[PDB]
Amino acid sequence: HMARYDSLLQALGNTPLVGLQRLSPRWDDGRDGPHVRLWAKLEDRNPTGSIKDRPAVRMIEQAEADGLLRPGATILEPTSGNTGISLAMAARLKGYRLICVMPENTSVERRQLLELYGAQIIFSATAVATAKELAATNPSWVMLYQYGNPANTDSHYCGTGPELLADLPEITHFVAGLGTTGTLMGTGRFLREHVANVKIVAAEPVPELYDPEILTARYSVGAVDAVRRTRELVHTEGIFAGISTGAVLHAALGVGAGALAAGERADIALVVADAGWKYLSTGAYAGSLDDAETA
Amino acid sequence: RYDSLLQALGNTPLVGLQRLSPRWDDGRDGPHVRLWAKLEDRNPTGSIKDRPAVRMIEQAEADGLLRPGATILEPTSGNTGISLAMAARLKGYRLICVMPENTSVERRQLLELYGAQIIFSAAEGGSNTAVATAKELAATNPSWVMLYQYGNPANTDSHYCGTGPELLADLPEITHFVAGLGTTGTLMGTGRFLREHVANVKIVAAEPRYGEGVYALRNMDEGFVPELYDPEILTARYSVGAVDAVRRTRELVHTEGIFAGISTGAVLHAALGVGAGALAAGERADIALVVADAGWKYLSTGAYAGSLDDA
Ligand code: NA
Incomplete structure (x- = not known):
């Protein structure tokens, strides 16, 4: 084997x-x-076509190692971009549900990419605060939080x-x-x-x-x-x-x-x-x- | 590496x-x-056609058909055109894709970005006319070559060897x-x-x-x-x-x-x-x-x- x-x-x-x-x-x-x-x-x-596959997978794995994530858990993330696509692929493959939280006026294109990867979508009026509130309602709901999670940095340090x-x-x-x-x-x-x-x-x-x-x-x-x-x-x-x-x-x-x-x-x-x-x-x-430039 | x-x-x-x-x-x-x-x-351009694209050009070079500032003509508007556009350019050739006027702007836009020139043949005649047009164009000089992906054994060979x-x-x-x-x-x-x-x-x-x-x-x-x-x-x-x-x-x-x-x-x-x-x-x-x-x-x-x- 070489790439199996x-x-x-x-x-x-x-x-x-x-x-x-x-x-x-x-x-x-x-x-x-x-x-x-x-x-x-x-x-x-990378699997979903961006560098965010790295932090996405390491955040999930680090959360598993630390006892935050368990078999039927849900991941919440305030994103509509590459991290959400990455987390949607990785979450699903590892057995988790992913909910992406974004503004109501997010582009349909972004929204439709997430949905095709099996993310559920919650719209906020802000997106970050509302994910944190959502996550706080349930011990089995976890926000990984790409902007503050050291597993993000670690994925690049180690990879x-x-x-x-x-x-x-x-x-x-x-x-x-x-x-x-x-x-x-x-x-x-x-x-x-x-x-x-x-x-x-x-x-x-x-x-x-x-x-x-x-x-x-x-x-x-x-x-x-x-x-x-x-x-x-x-x-x-x-x-x-x-x-x-x-x-x-x-x-x-x-x-x-x-x-x-x-x-x-x-x-x-x-x-x-x-x-x-x-x-x-x-x-x-x-x-x-x-x-x-206008685009 | x-x-x-x-x-x-x-x-x-x-x-x-x-x-x-x-x-x-x-x-x-x-x-x-x-x-x-x-x-x-x-692969380089996101599809399997990178394999035959590169092999067809190299087999053409091996056969003495292609040299420095040659032009490749291909009757394609899909993945092979994208792949030939990338390979051709990196290898120093010009690439002209021949396609029906009927062709989607979405399709054309991909080929353009990678640097292909586009020639449109009649909508009515479809790919048969596109192929005939590519071939008639290539015949206008010995430095202009059509690779013809539907008949080129290098296409097959790229899978046999890869x-x-x-x-x-x-x-x-x-x-x-x-x-x-x-x-x-x-x-x-x-x-x-x-x-x-x-x-x-x-x-x-x-x-x-x-x-x-x-x-x-x-x-x-x-x-x-x-x-x-x-x-x-x-x-x-x-x-x-x-x-x-x-x-x-x-x-x-x-x-x-x-x-x-x-x-x-x-x-x-x-x-x-x-x-x-x-x-x-x-x-x-x-x-x-x-x-x-x-x-x-x-x-x-x-x-x-x-x-x-x-x-
Ligand atoms: Na929670």
């Missing part, structure tokens, strides 16, 4: 790390100085970090998007403990998992530049990524440019957190950057 | 469907009947292989490999009912039979209606958490039919089935929400 699993759950993580030879400022070492390489960590190769170090011992920069901050905090803390002078770079446009002393830089990124980079990535490297990867790529190229102009070697790992599919029903990929 | 996205192809997971299998666990009263899902959406060996490696106990029939490459290549290496293996095609299309699949009575097709390879063919394909697609994501496209519903319907028969006969079975692509591109089609009649 008894459950979809076991096929989580161990995602490919792929060299971006065209988009890299300098892939080859040569006459004008050392290489500056970009390496995409493809987190859309994303190690995998990167294993595939890229020469790593000089890790770049990722800042949401719950679990990817940056978990991966960042692991890489700092192992790679001597590694830089941890956030791409964005106090979080409860945040640590003031992990991040070495933070890059803010506008939507036009995010879209621009997302289209560039698919046209030049064949990778069809979501909109947060556009932010991450803009930042990684800025870092790469820095290393190129300073005549230093870089091996920059960048997170591709999901694929472009869920974002099609918008302008991001077809037409004008302005139409996309 | 990959220098190119092209290298992150194949070696896809095989995952047991413990809930949907007719009987996952052997009992004192009967042996197991297991379903194993081969997840071909874990899909088949991977399956045997992960599932030496395989009794049945089930996949949808489109170009026939998957069935023809995987099926030939498996028949050569696994005594008494059954190769089962899933096809649409005449007149009831299932995306990416072809009924061979209704349609042109691909030149790749060898009828001797199959042990069985199952026709599947649109409603059965859709209900199984939904069932798969609800029960196993795998969000697959509609051809996979048809494959699952056939696999469960083969499984139900093994179970009734008291036979042991390990049934590998292809999950050829993910549900994402199909969600605009109402096939995942609302009533089965509407879908």
Whole structure:
């Protein structure tokens, strides 16, 4: 056997790390100085197509270990995004019910994805407070809470970090998007403990998992530049990524440019957190950057 | 560990469907009947067509048909076009997809993003005219090449050398292989490999009912039979209606958490039919089935929400 699993759950993580030879400022070492390489960590190769499969599964497992979750329990989560899809897949497979709590004016598209994965939906007028109230009514109802759960960070410490170090011992920069901050905090803390002078770079446009002393830089990124980079990535490297990867790529190229102009070697790992599919029903990929920007 | 996205192809997971299998666990009263899902959406562009796409280009290079700034013409608007657009671009070729004017903007939009140029042929003439147009275009110079996925032995060979060996490696106990029939490459290549290496293996095609299309699949009575097709390879063919394909697609994501496209519903319907028969006969079975692509591109089609009649 090489890739035989008894459950979809076991096929989580161990995602490919792929060299971006065209988009890299300098892939080859040569006459004008050392290489500056970009390496995409493809987190859309997870069961539900996003990096949130990692925290989702570890949150549930940690809750089981701590005695919070038991055979017929229900999981409550205030989300309408990748975490809810991830939790819906994982909950169901592990024997739990999942209720997602979201605003009444959440997009039908988001809502319908959750429902197809078997999540029940409760609408709030706020979403977080109402999940916590719902959860408090029943000892068998549990809110995992992605924004404050250390199992989120741990999933990257124990999974994303190690995998990167294993595939890229020469790593000089890790770049990722800042949401719950679990990817940056978990991966960042692991890489700092192992790679001597590694830089941890956030791409964005106090979080409860945040640590003031992990991040070495933070890059803010506008939507036009995010879209621009997302289209560039698919046209030049064949990778069809979501909109947060556009932010991450803009930042990684800025870092790469820095290393190129300073005549230093870089091996920059960048997170591709999901694929472009869920974002099609918008302008991001077809037409004008302005139409996309409005989407 | 990959220098190119092209290298992150194949070696896809095989995952047991413990809930949907007719009987996952052997009992004192009967042996197991297991379903194993081969997840071909874990490829570069999210489908099984990455395999033949890349092999067809490389075989063309081997044969001296393709060189640096050549143009590939393919009469396709589906997954093969997406896959050829990605591979072609990474390998330094231009890709032009020829399709009927009638083609969905949803379909066109995918090919455009990946960098394909699009040529529209007449709606009335369908794919036959699209193919003729591709071929007439390719004839206008020696540097313009049509790969022709319905007749290209590299399509078959990509499964004979990839899909088949991977399956045997992960599932030496395989009794049945089930996949949808489109170009026939998957069935023809995987099926030939498996028949050569696994005594008494059954190769089962899933096809649409005449007149009831299932995306990416072809009924061979209704349609042109691909030149790749060898009828001797199959042990069985199952026709599947649109409603059965859709209900199984939904069932798969609800029960196993795998969000697959509609051809996979048809494959699952056939696999469960083969499984139900093994179970009734008291036979042991390990049934590998292809999950050829993910549900994402199909969600605009109402096939995942609302009533089965509407879908
Ligand atoms: Na509770």
